[PDB]
Amino acid sequence: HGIRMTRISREMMKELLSVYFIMGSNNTKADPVTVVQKALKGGATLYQFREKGGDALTGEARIKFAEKAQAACREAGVPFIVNDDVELALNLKADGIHIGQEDANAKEVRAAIGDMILGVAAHTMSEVKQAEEDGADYVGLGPIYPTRAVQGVSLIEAVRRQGISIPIVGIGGITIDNAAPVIQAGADGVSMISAISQAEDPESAARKFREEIQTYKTG
Ligand SMILES: Nc1nc(C(F)(F)F)ncc1COP(=O)(O)OP(=O)(O)O
Ligand SMILES: [Mg+2]
């Protein structure tokens, strides 16, 4: 994964969303970077640097943590995605950026990031359709499981029913036990934080997701 000179293809984007690990320093009791390295070693196909909130790093501390996470993604050969922060995404030459409905407008972000990967969080058919024309390469629908209202795989099913094929990754309380339906509903992958970041064995946790997700995408 080098500097993209063209928009990422749906086939390649969908392969990456399979097991999508999201994590910040405050989502685990162990060593942040060490957990990420294990998640990759395990089988995670994409990672998103998400550092914000209460016990979250700031200033230089944050940036360096990001560089280490990105470095670990490099070794594993997995794309490094940044959350919210467009300025940082561009500075670290990250593979992508993810935004929600309250973050910078997708149109602007797309113009500022060139052909970088762009993920947009959607919650309604409208937001999905908008994300697509705004130039998003994929959308994160949810929260599927238990603020924003839980929606199961209803939206995911509505999107596929309208024939829309945009890459989709599910998000929200996803565990190894409830991930299958998300896929069966038509999602191209599942996103998780605690299911892996808080596992006593993150590496094996990521490995289980990898096996399950591949099994269900085939069937
Ligand atoms: N971070 C996210 N990542 C995904 C992804 F698709 F990547 F799985 N989907 C949805 C969200 C939620 O985005 P948002 O509401 O902006 O809040 P926050 O930045 O606090 O997560
Ligand atoms: Mg956000």
Pocket test for ligand 1, best of 16, 20, 26, 83 (most atoms within 8 A of CB): 83
Distance of alpha carbon 203 from alpha carbon 141, whole angstroms: 25
Identify the experimental approach: X-ray
DSSP code, position 124: S
Q: Considering every ligand atom, which ligand is closest to the CA of 121?
A: 1
Distance of alpha carbon 21 from alpha carbon 45, whole angstroms: 8
With a 6 Å cutoff on the Cβ, whether 98 touches ligand 1 is yes
Residue type at 207?
Answer: R
- CA 95, 175, 102: angle at the middle one, nearest 5? 50
Distance of alpha carbon 14 from alpha carbon 33, whole angstroms: 25
* Dihedral (Cα; 167, 193, 99, 62), 10-degree rounding: -140
> Which tokens belong to 155?
């939206």
Q: Identify which of 166, 169, 117, 160 has the alpha carbon closest to the alpha carbon of residue 140.
A: 169
Q: What are the structural domains of the chain? A: 1-219 (3.20.20.70)
Distance of alpha carbon 120 from alpha carbon 201, whole angstroms: 30
Cα 125 to Cα 164, 187, 217, distances in angstroms: 10, 15, 23
